[PDB]
Coordinates of C-alpha atoms in Angstrom, one line a residue:
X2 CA 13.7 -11.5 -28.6
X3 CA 12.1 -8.5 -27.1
X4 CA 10.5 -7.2 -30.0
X5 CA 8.6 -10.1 -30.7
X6 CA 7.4 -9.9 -26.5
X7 CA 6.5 -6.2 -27.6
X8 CA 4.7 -7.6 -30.8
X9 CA 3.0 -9.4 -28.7
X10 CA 1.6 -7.3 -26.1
X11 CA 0.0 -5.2 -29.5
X12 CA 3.0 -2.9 -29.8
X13 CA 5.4 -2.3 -32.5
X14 CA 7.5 0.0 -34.5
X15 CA 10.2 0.6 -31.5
X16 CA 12.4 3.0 -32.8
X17 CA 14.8 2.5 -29.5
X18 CA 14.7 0.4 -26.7
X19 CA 15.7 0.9 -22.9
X20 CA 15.6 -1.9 -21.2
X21 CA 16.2 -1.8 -17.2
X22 CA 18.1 2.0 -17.3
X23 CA 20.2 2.6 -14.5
X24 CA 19.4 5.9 -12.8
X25 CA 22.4 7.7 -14.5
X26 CA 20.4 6.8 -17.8
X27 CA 17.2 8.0 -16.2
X28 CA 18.5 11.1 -14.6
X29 CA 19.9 12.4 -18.0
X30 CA 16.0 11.1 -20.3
X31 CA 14.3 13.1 -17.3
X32 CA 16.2 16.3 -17.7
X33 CA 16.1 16.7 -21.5
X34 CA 15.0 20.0 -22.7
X35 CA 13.1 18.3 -25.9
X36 CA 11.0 16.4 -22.8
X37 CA 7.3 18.4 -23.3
X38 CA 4.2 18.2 -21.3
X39 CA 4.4 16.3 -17.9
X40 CA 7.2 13.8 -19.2
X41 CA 9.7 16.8 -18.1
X42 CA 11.9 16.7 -15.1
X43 CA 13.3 19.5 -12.9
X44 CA 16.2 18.9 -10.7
X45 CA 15.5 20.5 -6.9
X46 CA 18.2 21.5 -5.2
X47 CA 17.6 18.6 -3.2
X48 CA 19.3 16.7 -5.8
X49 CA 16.1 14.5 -6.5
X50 CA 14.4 15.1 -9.7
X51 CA 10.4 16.1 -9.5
X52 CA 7.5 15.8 -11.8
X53 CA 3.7 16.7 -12.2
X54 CA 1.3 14.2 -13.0
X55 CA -1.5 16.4 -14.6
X56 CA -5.0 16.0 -14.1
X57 CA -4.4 12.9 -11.3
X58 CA -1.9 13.6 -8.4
X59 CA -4.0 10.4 -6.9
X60 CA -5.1 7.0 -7.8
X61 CA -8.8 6.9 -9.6
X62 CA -10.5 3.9 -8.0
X63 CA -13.9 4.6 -10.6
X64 CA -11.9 3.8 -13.4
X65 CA -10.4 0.5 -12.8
X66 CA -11.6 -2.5 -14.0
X67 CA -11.0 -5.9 -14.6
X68 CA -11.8 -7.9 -17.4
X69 CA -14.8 -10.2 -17.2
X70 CA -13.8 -13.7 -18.3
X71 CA -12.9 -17.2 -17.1
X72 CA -9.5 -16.0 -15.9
X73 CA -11.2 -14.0 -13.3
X74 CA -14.3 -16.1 -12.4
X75 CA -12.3 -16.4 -8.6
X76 CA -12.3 -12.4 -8.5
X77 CA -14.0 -10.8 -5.7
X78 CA -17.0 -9.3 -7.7
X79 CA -18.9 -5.9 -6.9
X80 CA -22.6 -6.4 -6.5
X81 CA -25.8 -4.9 -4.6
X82 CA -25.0 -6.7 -1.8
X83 CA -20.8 -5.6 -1.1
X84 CA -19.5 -3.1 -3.4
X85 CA -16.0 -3.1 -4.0
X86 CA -13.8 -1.8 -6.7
X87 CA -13.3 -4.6 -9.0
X88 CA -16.2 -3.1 -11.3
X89 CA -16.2 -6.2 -15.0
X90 CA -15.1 -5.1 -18.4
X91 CA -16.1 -6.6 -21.6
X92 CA -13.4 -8.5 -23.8
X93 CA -14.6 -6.4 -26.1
X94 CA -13.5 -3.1 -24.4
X95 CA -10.3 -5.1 -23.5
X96 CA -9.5 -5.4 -27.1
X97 CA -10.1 -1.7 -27.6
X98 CA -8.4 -0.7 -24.5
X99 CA -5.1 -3.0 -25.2
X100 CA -5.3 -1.1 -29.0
X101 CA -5.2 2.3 -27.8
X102 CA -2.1 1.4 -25.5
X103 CA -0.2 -0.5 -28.3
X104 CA -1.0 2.1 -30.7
X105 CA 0.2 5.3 -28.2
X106 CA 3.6 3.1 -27.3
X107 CA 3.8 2.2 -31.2
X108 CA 6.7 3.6 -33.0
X109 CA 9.0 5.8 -30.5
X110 CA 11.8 5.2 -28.2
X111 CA 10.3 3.1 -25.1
X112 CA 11.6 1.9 -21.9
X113 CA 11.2 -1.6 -21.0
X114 CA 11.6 -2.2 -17.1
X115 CA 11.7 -5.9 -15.7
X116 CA 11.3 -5.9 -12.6
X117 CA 10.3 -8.9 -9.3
X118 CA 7.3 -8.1 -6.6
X119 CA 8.1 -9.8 -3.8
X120 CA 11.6 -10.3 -2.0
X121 CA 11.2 -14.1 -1.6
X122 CA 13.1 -15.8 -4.3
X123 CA 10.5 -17.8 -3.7
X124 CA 6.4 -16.8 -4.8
X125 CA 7.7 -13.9 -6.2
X126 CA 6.3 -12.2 -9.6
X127 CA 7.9 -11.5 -12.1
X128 CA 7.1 -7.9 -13.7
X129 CA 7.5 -6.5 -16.8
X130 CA 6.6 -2.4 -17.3
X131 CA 6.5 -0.3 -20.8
X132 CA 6.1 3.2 -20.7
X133 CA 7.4 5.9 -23.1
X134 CA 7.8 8.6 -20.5
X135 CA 11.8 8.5 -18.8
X136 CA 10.5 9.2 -15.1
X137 CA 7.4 6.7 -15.3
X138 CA 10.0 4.0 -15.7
X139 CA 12.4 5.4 -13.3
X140 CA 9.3 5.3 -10.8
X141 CA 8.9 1.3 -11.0
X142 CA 12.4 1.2 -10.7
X143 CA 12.6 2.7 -7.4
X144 CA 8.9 1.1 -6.0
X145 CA 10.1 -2.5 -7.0
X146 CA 13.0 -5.4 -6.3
X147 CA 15.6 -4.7 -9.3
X148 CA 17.1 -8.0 -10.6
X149 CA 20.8 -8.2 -10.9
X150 CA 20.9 -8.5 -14.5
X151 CA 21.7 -12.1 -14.5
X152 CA 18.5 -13.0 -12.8
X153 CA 17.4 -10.6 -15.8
X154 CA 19.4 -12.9 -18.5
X155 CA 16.2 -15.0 -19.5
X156 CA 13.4 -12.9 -17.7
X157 CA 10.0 -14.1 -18.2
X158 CA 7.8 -12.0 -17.2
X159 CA 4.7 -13.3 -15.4
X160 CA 2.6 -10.1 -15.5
X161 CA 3.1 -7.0 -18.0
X162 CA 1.9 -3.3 -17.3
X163 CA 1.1 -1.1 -20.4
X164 CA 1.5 2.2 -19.2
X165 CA 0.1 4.4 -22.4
X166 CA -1.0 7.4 -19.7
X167 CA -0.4 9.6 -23.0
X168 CA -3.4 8.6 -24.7
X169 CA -7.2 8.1 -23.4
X170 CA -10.4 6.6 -24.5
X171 CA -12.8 9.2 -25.8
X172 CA -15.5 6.1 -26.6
X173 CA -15.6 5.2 -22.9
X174 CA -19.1 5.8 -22.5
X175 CA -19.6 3.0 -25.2
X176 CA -17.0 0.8 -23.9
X177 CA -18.9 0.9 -20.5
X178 CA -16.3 2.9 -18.8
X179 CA -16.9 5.9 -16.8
X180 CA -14.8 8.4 -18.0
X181 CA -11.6 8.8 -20.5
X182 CA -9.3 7.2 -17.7
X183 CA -8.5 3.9 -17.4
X184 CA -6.6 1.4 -15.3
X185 CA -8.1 -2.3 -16.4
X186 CA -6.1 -6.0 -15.5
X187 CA -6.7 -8.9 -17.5
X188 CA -6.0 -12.0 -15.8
X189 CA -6.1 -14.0 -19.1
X190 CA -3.3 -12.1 -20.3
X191 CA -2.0 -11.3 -17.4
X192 CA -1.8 -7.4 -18.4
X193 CA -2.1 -3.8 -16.7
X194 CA -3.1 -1.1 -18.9
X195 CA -2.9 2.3 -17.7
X196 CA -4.6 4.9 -19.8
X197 CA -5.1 9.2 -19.3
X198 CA -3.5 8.9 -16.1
X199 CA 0.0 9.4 -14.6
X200 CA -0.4 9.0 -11.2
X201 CA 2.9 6.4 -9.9
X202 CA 0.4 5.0 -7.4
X203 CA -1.6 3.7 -10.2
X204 CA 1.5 1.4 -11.1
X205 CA 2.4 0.6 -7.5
X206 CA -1.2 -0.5 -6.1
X207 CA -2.1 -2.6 -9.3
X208 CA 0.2 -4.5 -9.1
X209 CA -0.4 -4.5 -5.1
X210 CA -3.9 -5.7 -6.4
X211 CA -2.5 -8.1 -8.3
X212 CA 0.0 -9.6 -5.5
X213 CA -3.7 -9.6 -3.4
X214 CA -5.0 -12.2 -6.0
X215 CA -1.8 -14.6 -6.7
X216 CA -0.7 -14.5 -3.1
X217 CA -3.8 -15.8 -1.1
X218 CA -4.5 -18.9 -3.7
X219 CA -1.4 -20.2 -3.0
X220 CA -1.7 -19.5 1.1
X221 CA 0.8 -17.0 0.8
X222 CA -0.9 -14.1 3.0
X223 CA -0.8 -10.7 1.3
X224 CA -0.8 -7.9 3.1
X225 CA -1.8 -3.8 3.3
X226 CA 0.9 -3.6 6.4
X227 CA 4.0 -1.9 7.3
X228 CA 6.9 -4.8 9.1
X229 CA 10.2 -4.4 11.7
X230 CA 12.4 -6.5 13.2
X231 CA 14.7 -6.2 16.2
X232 CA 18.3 -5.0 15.4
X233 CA 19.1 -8.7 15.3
X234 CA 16.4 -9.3 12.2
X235 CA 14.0 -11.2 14.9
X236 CA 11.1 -11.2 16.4
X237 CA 9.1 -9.9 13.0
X238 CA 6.0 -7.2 13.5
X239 CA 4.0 -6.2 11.3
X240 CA 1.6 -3.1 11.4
X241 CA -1.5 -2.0 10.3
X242 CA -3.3 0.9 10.3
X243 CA -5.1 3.5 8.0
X244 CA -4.3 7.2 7.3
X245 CA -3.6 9.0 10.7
X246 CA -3.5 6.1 12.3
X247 CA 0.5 6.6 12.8
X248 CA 1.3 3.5 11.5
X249 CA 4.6 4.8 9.9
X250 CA 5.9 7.0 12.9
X251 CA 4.8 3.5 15.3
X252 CA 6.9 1.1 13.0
X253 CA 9.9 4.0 12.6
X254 CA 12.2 2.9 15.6
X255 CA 16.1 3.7 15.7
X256 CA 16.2 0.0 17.2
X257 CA 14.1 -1.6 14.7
X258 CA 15.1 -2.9 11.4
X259 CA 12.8 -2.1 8.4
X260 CA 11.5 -4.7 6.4
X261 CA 8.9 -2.6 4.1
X262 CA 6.3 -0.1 5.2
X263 CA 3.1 -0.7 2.3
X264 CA 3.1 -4.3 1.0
X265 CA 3.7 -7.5 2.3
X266 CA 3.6 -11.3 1.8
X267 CA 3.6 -13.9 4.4
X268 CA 4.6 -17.2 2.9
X269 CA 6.6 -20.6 4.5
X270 CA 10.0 -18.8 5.0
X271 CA 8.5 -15.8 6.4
X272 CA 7.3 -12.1 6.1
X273 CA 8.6 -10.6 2.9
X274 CA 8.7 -6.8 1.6
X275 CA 6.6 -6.8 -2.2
X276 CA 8.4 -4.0 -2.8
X277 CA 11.7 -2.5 -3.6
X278 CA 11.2 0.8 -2.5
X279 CA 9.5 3.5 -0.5
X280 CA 6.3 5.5 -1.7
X281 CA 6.0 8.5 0.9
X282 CA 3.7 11.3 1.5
X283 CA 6.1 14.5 1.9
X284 CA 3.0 17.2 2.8
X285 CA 4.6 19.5 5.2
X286 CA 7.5 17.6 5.2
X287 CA 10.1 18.6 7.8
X288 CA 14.1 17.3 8.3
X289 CA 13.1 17.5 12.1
X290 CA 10.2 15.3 12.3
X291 CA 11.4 12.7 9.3
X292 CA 14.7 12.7 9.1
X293 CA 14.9 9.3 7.7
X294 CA 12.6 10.2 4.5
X295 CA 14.0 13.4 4.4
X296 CA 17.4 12.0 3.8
X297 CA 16.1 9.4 1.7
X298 CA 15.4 12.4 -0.8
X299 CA 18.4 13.0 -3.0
X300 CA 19.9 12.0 -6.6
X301 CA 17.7 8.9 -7.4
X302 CA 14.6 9.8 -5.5
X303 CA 11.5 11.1 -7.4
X304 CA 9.9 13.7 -5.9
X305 CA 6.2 13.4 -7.6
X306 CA 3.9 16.8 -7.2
X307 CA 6.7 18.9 -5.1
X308 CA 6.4 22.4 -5.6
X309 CA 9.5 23.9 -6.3
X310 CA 10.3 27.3 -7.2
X311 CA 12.9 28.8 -10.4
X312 CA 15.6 28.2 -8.4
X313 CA 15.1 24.7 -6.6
X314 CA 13.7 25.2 -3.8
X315 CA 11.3 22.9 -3.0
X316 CA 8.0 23.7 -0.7
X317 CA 6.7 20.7 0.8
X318 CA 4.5 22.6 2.7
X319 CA 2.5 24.1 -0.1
X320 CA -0.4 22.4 -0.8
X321 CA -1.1 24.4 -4.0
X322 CA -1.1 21.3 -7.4
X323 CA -2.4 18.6 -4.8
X324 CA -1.7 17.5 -0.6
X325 CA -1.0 14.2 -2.2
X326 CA 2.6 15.2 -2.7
X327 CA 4.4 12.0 -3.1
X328 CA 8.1 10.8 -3.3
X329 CA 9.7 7.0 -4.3
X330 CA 13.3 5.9 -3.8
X331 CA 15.0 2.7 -3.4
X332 CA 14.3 1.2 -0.5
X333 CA 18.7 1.5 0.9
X334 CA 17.9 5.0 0.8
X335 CA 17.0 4.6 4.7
X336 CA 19.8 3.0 6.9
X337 CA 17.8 1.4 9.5
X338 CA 16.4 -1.5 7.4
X339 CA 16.7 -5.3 7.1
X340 CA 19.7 -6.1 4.6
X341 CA 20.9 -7.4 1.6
X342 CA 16.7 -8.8 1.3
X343 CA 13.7 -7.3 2.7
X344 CA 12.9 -10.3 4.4
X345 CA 12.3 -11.5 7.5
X346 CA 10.8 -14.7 9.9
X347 CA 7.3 -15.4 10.8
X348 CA 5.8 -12.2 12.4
X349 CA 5.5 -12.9 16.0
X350 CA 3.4 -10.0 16.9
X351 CA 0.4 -8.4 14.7
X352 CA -1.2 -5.4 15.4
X353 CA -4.0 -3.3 14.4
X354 CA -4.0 0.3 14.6
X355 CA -6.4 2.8 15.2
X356 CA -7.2 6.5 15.8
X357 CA -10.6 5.8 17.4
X358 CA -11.8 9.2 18.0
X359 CA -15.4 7.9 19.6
X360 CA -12.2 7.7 22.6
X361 CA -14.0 4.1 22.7
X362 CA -11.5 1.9 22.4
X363 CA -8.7 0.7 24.9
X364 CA -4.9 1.7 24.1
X365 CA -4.3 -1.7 23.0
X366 CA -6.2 -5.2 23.2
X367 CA -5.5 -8.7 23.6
X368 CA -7.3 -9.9 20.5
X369 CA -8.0 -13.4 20.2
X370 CA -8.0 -15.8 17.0
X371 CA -11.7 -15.0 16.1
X372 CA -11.4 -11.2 17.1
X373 CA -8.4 -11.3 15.0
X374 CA -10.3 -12.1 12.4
X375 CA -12.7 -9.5 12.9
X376 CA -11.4 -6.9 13.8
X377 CA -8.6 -7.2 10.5
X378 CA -12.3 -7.8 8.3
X379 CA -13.2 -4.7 9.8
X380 CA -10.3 -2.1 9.4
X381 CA -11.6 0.9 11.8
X382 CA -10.5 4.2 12.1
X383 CA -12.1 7.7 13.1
X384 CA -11.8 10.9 11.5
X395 CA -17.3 11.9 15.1
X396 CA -17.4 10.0 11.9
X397 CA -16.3 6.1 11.9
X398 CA -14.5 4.5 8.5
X399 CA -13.8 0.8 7.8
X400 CA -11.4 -0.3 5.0
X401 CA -11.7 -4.3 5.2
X402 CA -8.2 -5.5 5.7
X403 CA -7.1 -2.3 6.1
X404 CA -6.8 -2.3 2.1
X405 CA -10.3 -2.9 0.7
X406 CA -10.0 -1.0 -2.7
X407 CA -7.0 -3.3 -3.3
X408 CA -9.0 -6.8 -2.3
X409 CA -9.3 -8.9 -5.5
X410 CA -10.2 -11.5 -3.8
X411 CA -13.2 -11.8 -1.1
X412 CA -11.9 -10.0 2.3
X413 CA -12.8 -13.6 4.2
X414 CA -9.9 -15.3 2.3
X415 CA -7.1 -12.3 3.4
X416 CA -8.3 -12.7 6.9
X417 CA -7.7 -16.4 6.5
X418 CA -4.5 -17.1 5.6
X419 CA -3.6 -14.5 7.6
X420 CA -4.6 -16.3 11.0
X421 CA -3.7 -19.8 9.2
X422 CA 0.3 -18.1 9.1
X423 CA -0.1 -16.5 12.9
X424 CA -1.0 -19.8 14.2
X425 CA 2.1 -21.2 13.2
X426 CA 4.3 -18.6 14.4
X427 CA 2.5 -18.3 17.9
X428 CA 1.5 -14.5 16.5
X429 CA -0.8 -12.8 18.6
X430 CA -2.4 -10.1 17.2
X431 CA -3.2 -6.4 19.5
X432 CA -5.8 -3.9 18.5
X433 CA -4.2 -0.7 19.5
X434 CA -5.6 3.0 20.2
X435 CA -3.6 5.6 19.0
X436 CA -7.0 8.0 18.5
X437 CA -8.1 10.1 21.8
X438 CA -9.8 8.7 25.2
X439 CA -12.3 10.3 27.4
X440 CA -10.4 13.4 28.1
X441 CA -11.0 14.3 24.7
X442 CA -7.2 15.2 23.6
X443 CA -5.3 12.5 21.5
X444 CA -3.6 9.9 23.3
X445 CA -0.2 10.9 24.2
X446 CA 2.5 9.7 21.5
X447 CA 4.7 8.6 24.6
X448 CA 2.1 6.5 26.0
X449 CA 1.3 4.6 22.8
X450 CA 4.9 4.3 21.7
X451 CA 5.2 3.0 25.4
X452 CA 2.7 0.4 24.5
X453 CA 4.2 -1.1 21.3
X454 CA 7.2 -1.4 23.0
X455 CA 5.3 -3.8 25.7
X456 CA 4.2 -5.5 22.6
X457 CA 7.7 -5.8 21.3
X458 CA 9.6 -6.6 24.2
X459 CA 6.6 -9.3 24.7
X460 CA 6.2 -7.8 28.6
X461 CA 3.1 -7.5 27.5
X462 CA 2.6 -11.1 27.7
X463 CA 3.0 -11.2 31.5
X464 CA 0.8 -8.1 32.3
X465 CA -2.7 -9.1 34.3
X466 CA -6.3 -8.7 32.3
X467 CA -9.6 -7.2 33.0
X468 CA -11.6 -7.5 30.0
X469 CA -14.4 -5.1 28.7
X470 CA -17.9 -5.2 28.4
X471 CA -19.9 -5.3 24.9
X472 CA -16.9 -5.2 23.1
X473 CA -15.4 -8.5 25.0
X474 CA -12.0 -6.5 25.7
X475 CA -8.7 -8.0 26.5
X476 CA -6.7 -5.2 28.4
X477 CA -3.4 -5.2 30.7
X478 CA -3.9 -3.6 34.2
X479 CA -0.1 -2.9 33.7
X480 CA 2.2 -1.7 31.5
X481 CA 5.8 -0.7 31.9
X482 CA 5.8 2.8 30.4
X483 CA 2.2 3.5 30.7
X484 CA -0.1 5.7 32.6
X485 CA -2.1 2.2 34.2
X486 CA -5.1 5.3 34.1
X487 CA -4.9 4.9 30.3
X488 CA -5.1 1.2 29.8
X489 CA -9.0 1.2 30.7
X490 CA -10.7 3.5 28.3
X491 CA -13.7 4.5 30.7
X492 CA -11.1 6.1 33.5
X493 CA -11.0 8.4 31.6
X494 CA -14.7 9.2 31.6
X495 CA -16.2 11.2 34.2
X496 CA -19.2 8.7 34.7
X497 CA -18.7 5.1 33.0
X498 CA -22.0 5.7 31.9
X499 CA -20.9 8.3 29.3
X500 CA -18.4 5.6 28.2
X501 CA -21.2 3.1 27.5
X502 CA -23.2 5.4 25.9
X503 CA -20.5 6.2 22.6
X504 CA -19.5 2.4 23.0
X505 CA -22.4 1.3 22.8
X506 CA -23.2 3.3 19.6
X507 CA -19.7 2.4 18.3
X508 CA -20.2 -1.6 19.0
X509 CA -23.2 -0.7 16.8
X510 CA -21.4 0.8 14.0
X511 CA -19.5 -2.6 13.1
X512 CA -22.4 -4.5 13.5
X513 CA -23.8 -2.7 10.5
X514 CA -20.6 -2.5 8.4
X515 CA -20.3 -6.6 9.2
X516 CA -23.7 -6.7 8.0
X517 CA -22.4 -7.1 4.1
X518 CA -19.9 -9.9 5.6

């Protein structure tokens, strides 16, 4: 009955199959002395197991591609006008592409993982993975919701992922690929095919990209965000934010429940976690300054990239293979989270982080339903150099950005969600806003005081600001205060306001 699904997806000759290991079956595949290459496991003496990933410790945007047929005819495109990263693939190189990965899981022992994306009973996907490597399939076991083997008694999987990260395609240049990598989706067949890379993140985010297509045509908002409730599993926020924009260490509060911190969907019943686990960043890691991740890293977790010396010790400081040091676990690895579902009511507030370091911006905004819009369309952040990420997710957008934007509102609307674009980047005195200020100012979004603080407003950029807020310097909450002359102020703003005029331009 499986063999037949595996004869059908172009592989055959499984010698064994591993369907859905627990991770007492994983544990024991990943730490097998035969394991050669980057399939082996080492045990830290953390207790969670660690692997390398080879040439890609990082997703490879350049090499993923969808294929070009009817199927995808409602796929957001690249063109001259707005590139994006869904770059077309002949059927032809489909063919080829869905040979090699039959062919490289042909004939060996495989693991067969299905899985759901989406904690909603409801609008969720169902997910079936095949790799050959022990720790690839342990990954998807810890980044997505695992069924309770009854739900798994007639699974029918509504997209399948090929990982064949073994093999590669040497005739890329002919296939119109651009290098021996490749990560291609075909909506027809509803197939992911990883090839010549091992990054996790390539498994994670395509299906992520895939969510991003499904989702939004049925008005079911998907969503690069991070989401809390109160202790009660109320009042639903959701955050977004680029790198550095703290939206993690913002959305990590001891009285806030944790829905999901990557991926979520916004459908009738409410905001819902895509995922069934955690993908961290553990660079310079440190017990004292995450002690909920670090704690989340035992028997079970992956660490993915850690270097770790002959004895155990791992150094998640050095920066030495890659600084995209990564680690997955099972979501109930962290205590403070929403429980036995990651799911949660209607998001009541919405906000939009960012580490504007033009110190243009105001700690946080009022936005309004068309700002929203904007604002969300436009993704800003600061490294004095300014990048936008449409949605806060744009290589993940299969679909135009206008559409996540709009089912986004259409679900706020009906929630009475009021979205906040918030500052957590540096002012006019030139050092970063203080983390006790900005904290102070989510909690005032929260709490909802913010709704009863007085306005302003703010010129060029149309600015919604509160005079007051209870656990903030008031001299923060205008952002030319803390100029010497306002002139100075409008001077950057003005070049800023500038900036998303130009990015909008391809809108």
């Amino acid at each position: 009955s499986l063999s037949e699904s595996l004869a059908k997806y172009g592989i055959t000759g499984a010698t064994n199959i591993v369907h859905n290991p627990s991770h007492e079956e994983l544990f024991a595949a990943e730490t097998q002395a035969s394991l050669e290459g980057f399939e082996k496991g080492t045990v830290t003496e953390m207790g969670a197991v660690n692997v390398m990933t080879g040439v890609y410790t990082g997703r490879s945007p350049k090499d993923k591609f969808i294929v070009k047929n009817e199927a995808s005819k409602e796929i957001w495109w690249t063109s001259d006008e707005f590139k994006n990263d869904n770059k077309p693939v002949t059927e032809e190189a489909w063919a080829q592409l869905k040979a090699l990965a039959g062919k490289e899981l042909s004939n060996k022992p495989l693991y067969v993982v299905d899985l759901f994306c989406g904690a909603n009973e409801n609008t969720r996907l169902k997910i079936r993975f095949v790799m050959e490597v022990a720790w690839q399939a342990h990954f998807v076991t810890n980044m997505f919701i695992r069924p309770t083997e009854e739900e798994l008694k007639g699974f029918e999987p509504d997209f399948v992922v090929l990982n064949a990260s073994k093999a590669k395609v040497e005739n890329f240049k002919e296939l119109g690929l651009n290098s021996e990598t490749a990560v291609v989706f075909n909506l027809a067949e509803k197939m992911q095919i990883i090839l010549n890379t091992w990054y996790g993140g390539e498994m994670k985010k395509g299906m992520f990209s895939m969510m991003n297509f499904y989702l939004p045509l049925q008005g079911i908002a998907a969503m690069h965000c991070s989401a809390n409730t109160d202790l009660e599993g109320k009042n639903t926020a959701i955050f977004f934010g680029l790198s550095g924009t703290g939206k993690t260490t913002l959305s990590t509060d001891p009285k806030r429940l944790l829905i999901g911190d990557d991926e979520h969907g916004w459908d009738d019943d409410g905001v819902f976690n895509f995922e069934g686990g955690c993908y961290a960043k553990v660079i310079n890691l440190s017990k004292e300054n995450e002690p909920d991740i670090w704690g989340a890293i035992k028997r079970n977790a992956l660490l993915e990239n850690v270097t770790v010396d002959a004895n155990g010790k791992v150094d998640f400081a050095d920066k030495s293979v890659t600084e995209n040091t990564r680690v997955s676990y099972p979501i109930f690895h962290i205590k403070n989270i929403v429980k036995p579902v990651s799911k949660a009511p209607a998001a009541k507030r919405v906000i939009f982080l960012s580490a504007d370091a033009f110190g243009v911006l105001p700690p946080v905004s009022i936005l309004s339903k068309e700002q929203t819009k904007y604002y969300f369309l436009s993704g800003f952040t600061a490294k004095p150099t300014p990048t936008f990420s449409s949605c806060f997710g744009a290589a993940f957008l299969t679909l135009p950005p206008t559409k996540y934007a709009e089912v986004l509102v259409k679900r706020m609307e009906a929630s009475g969600a009021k979205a906040y674009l918030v500052n957590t980047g540096w002012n006019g005195t030139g050092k970063r806003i203080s983390i006790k200020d900005t904290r102070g100012i989510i909690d005032a979004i929260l709490d909802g005081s913010i709704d009863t603080a007085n306005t302003a407003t703010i010129p060029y950029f149309n600015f919604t600001v509160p005079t007051e807020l209870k656990g903030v310097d008031t001299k923060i909450l205008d952002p030319r205060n803390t100029y010497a002359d306002a002139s100075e102020w409008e001077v950057k703003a003005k070049d800023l306001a500038e900036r998303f005029q130009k990015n909008f331009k391809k809108f």
